Swiss-Prot record, chain A:
Changing S40A: In strain: Alpha/B.1.1.7. The chain holds residues 943 to 991 of 1273 of the full protein. Subunit of the fusion protein that is processed upon entry into the host cell. Mediates fusion of the virion and cellular membranes by functioning as a class I viral fusion protein. Contains a viral fusion peptide that is unmasked after S2 cleavage. This cleavage can occur at the cell membrane by host TMPRSS2 or during endocytosis by host CSTL. In either case, this triggers an extensive and irreversible conformational change that leads to fusion of the viral envelope with the cellular cytoplasmic membrane, releasing viral genomic RNA into the host cell cytoplasm. Changing Q12H: In strain: Omicron/BA.1, Omicron/BA.2, Omicron/BA.2.12.1, Omicron/BA.2.75, Omicron/BA.4, Omicron/BA.5, Omicron/BQ.1.1, Omicron/XBB.1.5, Omicron/EG.5.1. This is Spike protein S2'. Changing D8N: In strain: Delta/B.1.617.2, Mu/B.1.621. It comes from Severe acute respiratory syndrome coronavirus 2 (2019-nCoV). Residues 7-49 form a coiled coil.
UniProtKB/Swiss-Prot annotation, chain B:
Changing D8N: In strain: Omicron/BA.2, Omicron/BA.2.12.1, Omicron/BA.2.75, Omicron/BA.4, Omicron/BA.5, Omicron/BQ.1.1, Omicron/XBB.1.5, Omicron/EG.5.1; complete loss of interaction with host integrins. The lineage of its organism: Viruses, Riboviria, Orthornavirae, Pisuviricota, Pisoniviricetes. Changing G49S: In strain: Omicron/BA.1, Omicron/BA.2.75, Omicron/XBB.1.5, Omicron/EG.5.1. Residues 6-8 are annotated as: Integrin-binding motif. It comes from the Viruses. Binds to host ACE2. RBD also interacts with the N-linked glycan on 'Asn-90' of ACE2. Cleavage of S generates a polybasic C-terminal sequence on S1 that binds to host Neuropilin-1 (NRP1) and Neuropilin-2 (NRP2) receptors. Interacts with host integrin alpha-5/beta-1 (ITGA5:ITGB1) and with ACE2 in complex with integrin alpha-5/beta-1 (ITGA5:ITGB1). May interact via cytoplasmic c-terminus with M protein. May interact (via N-terminus) with host bilirubin and biliverdin, thereby preventing antibody binding to the SARS-CoV-2 spike NTD via an allosteric mechanism. This is Spike protein S1. Attaches the virion to the cell membrane by interacting with host receptor, initiating the infection. The major receptor is host ACE2. When S2/S2' has been cleaved, binding to the receptor triggers direct fusion at the cell membrane. When S2/S2' has not been cleaved, binding to the receptor results in internalization of the virus by endocytosis using host TFRC and GRM2 and leading to fusion of the virion membrane with the host endosomal membrane. Alternatively, may use NRP1/NRP2 and integrin as entry receptors.
Length: 49, 49
């Protein structure tokens, strides 16, 4: 428990990277989270929306 | 531009909205900064047979 500050910084950076990669795979109010299924199963207007 | 279509095919002529006529005859992209005008012409363009 002595090496706390450096370990805390490393853990914070890892958690930030993980939550960023997780937010990339979010819906954000859409029907899915993948762009291919959206551009392939929707009409161009709703697709670009 | 001028063309003759039926009733159900009028709504298909719109920016972004696809269908049967706006795929091989007259396609309108999502940049149409004109304005569609249309009216009924079943009094001088139709004939028996």
């Amino acid at each position: 428990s002595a090496l706390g500050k450096l370990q805390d910084v490393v853990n914070q950076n890892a958690q930030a990277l993980n939550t960023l990669v997780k937010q990339l795979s979010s819906n954000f109010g859409a029907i899915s989270s993948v762009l291919n299924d959206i551009l392939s199963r929707l009409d161009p207007p709703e697709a670009e929306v | 531009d001028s063309f003759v279509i039926r009733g159900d095919e009028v709504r298909q002529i719109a920016p972004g909205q696809t269908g049967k006529i706006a795929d091989y005859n007259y396609k309108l992209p999502d940049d149409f900064t004109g304005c569609v005008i249309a009216w009924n012409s079943n009094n001088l363009d139709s004939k028996v047979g």
